[PDB]
A paper describes a structure:
BRD4 contains two tandem bromodomains (BD1 and BD2) that recognize acetylated lysine for epigenetic reading, and these bromodomains are promising therapeutic targets for treating various diseases, including cancers. BD1 has four α helices (αZ, αA, αB, and αC) as the skeletal backbone, and they are linked with three loops named the ZA, AB, and BC loops. The Kac and inhibitor binding site (ligand binding site) of BD1 is formed by ZA and BC loops, and most interacting residues reside on those loops (yellow and magenta in Fig. 1a,b; the key residues are illustrated as sticks). We characterized the binding modes by determining the crystal structures of BD1 in complex with four selected inhibitors.
In addition, the substitution from methyl to trifluoromethyl at R1 did not much improved the IC50 value. The overall orientations oftriazolo[4,3-b]pyridazine are nearly the same in all four compounds. The N1 nitrogen atom of the triazole of the core scaffold forms hydrogen bonds with Asn140. Two hydrophobic interactions between the core scaffold and Leu94 and the core scaffold and Tyr139 are common features in 5, 6, and 12. In addition, the hydrophilic trifluoromethyl moiety in 6 lost its hydrophobic interaction with Val87, while others maintained this interaction. Another common feature of the compound 5-, 6-, 12-BD1 complex is that the indole group contacts Trp81, Asp145, and Ile146 through hydrophobic interactions. The W1 molecule in the 6-BD1 complex contributed to an additional hydrogen bond with the trifluoromethyl moiety. The C4 and C5 positions in indole and the C2 and C3 positions in piperidine were electrically neutral, and they interacted with Trp81, which is an electrically neutral residue (region III). It is an exception that the fluorine atoms of the trifluoromethyl moiety, which are highly negative, were close to electrically neutral region II. However, the fluorine atom of 6 did not directly contact neutral region II but formed water-mediated interactions.
Numbering used by the authors: 44 to 166
The structure:
């Protein structure tokens, strides 16, 4: 396993915005409770899950546990940065797997719910 993505970086400029607060309170916390959220709540453990090629393929890993901790730690500058992390998470699942795989069906459902929630954001 490589080290997981950082959740703190003292030199990085940070900001609290209404949209980032909404991404944590509403978007993250709703997706987190979905029946399909569990594979995505922590970094992929390639040793535990016996996926020795996972990080041979996936070079920008991302997961909702990392996103949650970034949001709680005030890591982001803006909502778009956080949205990009969600998109990286979904894309990684699609890249490492194949259409029709159970885990891909899970990511597809979560991505549709994610887009539904970010379609309208607070001002
Ligand atoms: F680690 C991640 F994020 F779960 C993840 N991303 N791509 C993948 C590809 C395979 C995988 N095997 C872990 C156990 C498992 C076997 N069949 C499943 C069907 C749905 C969910 C988990 C599984 N886990 N995996
Ligand atoms: Cl601020």
């Amino acid at each position: 396993n490589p080290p997981p993505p950082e959740t703190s970086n003292p030199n990085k400029p940070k900001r609290q915005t209404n949209q980032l607060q909404y991404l944590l309170r509403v978007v993250l916390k709703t997706l987190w409770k979905h029946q399909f959220a569990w594979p995505f709540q922590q970094p992929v453990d390639a040793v535990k899950l016996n996926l020795p090629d996972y990080y041979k393929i996936i070079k920008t890993p991302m997961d909702m546990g990392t996103i949650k901790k970034r949001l709680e730690n005030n890591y982001y500058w803006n909502a778009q940065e956080c949205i990009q992390d969600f998109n990286t998470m979904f894309t990684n699942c699609y890249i490492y797997n194949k259409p029709g795989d159970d885990i891909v069906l899970m990511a597809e459902a979560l991505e549709k719910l994610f887009l539904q929630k970010i379609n309208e954001l607070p001002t």
